[PDB]
Amino acid sequence: MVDPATLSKLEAGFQKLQNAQDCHSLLKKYLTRDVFDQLKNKKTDMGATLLDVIQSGVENLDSGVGIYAPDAQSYKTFAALFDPIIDDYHKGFKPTDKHPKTDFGNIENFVNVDPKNEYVLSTRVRCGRSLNGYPFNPMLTEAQYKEMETKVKGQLATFEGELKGTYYPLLGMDKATQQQLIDDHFLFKEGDRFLQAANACRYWPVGRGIFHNDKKTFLMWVNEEDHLRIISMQKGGDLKEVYGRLVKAVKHIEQKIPFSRDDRLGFLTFCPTNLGTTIRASVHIKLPKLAADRKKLEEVAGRYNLQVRGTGGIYDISNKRRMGLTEYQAVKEMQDGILELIKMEKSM
Template structure:
């Protein structure tokens, strides 16, 4: 049976929906003044006005989450671009006066908008973007899911992590065919094995300061781990940033093959696990940037000509609704001239529309690279 409450990160009592403690409000007041006087350009600073702050600072969800649990990362990192995380699924409604404008600014998704129903579409729509293997090193598509009945990292107790891990692993162990694999818990994993998986871009790691400040690394490494098949073309991260991160990947640019594998994997997991899906936001996630389909479809790609002018590359990416990241993901640099290009939009589109946007964008980027002098 799942736990429905946990100890809040900012107060010691297990608590139901009500008011934040005096200590939490005191910390919020001090931190708000520092943010207001800072040179931060985060969406948190832009939209957390004094009026909204005063309205939200005393609120608390049934899981015990407060405004402080949602904004502590942005309060500690003034260079954040967003600065907010949902401490539990209820935060999107209880603190809507803050989340709604941030979500609109990032996604262009208005308060009156609704996420369309799940629609994977025909998987054979997408072909190999780079059949000669000249540019694309690898393709990866992932999506996130939240198990019903639990908060997110800032308000998760050690037992939450263990319960979620047990539920997910029991289902993963029943998979067959190309999805059959082995679960590797972080607890007890040899350091050399762990580092090898990290260096190969298969495994997540602790240490991102934005997630650390958001209290997303509680009870580390309890309840965390990675499941993968023999070929490492199907992987599941358990309790990293979200409860589940389901991903499929392989060398080269065959987007259609990777997408087909992901759709099949998610379909199988949904038969045994209950995930939270909001009529408004689609699949609910820890970070508001991942709401909606939660899909991030990316390629590791070599673009020597375009990369010689990063402003041009980033402008092109923006034109096609793509993001440019370093090889190891967000907040990292390129390695060996290889960049990570992925879709930026996840909310307000169907799964198939997200994939089509990514596929078209990468196709156009490749045309520009081939024609560049």
């Protein structure tokens, strides 16, 4: 299966990890001699090897995680490394644990969390999707990139109503269109060194592109870090509208384009930190009184499993959990935690 030069590079990679004293990656922690020897000779049907998993962490010793999935099967083929790292990063998701079946849940249970616009500047829900049958960035060919983009454009063209918009291929993008997408904060470029070393930006920019709806309240990136990155956002705190819009879009795409979904892991992506729901629900919020006692703000946010990161007292607050809960649960606890943060603010 695996050719001797790959095996030798894999061994040289292992040794580098072992000799890097200040390396803190999950790759280094869980790639033991035993795991390495167990996997090094294995290869997915699409031809991915352990090197296709490991290379970025070898090259980039300062990586947090240090590995990526070159295809869907790689999660299984190299489970003996993915499982312990998934467990570590997702804070207790064991080899035997299972992610729930998809459930976007009852849209009517979502509200506007700040109807008077007193606190929440903006709301945003994002998910990732791989398309069924395709390898991930580390293994995709130029022809695959192109043919996948073709399919995606098919579905983009048939969005209706609020979701209708424009597709902008990076290939042949003029500098005026570029400048507009920069001003919009909608453009992506070739990735950093972590992505380069993972071979996640080859054949650039073939098959890469950007779609937004007319109102610029919906955004897709095609073939950045994942086949699809799907984002709904707007000013204010109407999470109902934002979440509802995302879900409508995913189901429209899925009409004719099946996604890669695993029973154990949920929706499969190029990065293991982004499995399960793949959902990041967030708001930008101004909390004047809580901002003055961040200890209390982190603590309260913590009760609802929310992360707080800054930027005048503004914070981005989002769900930290992706795996082991439904789409509905993830966004509902975000909603509940923001409501409670608002009630806290008002009361103080």
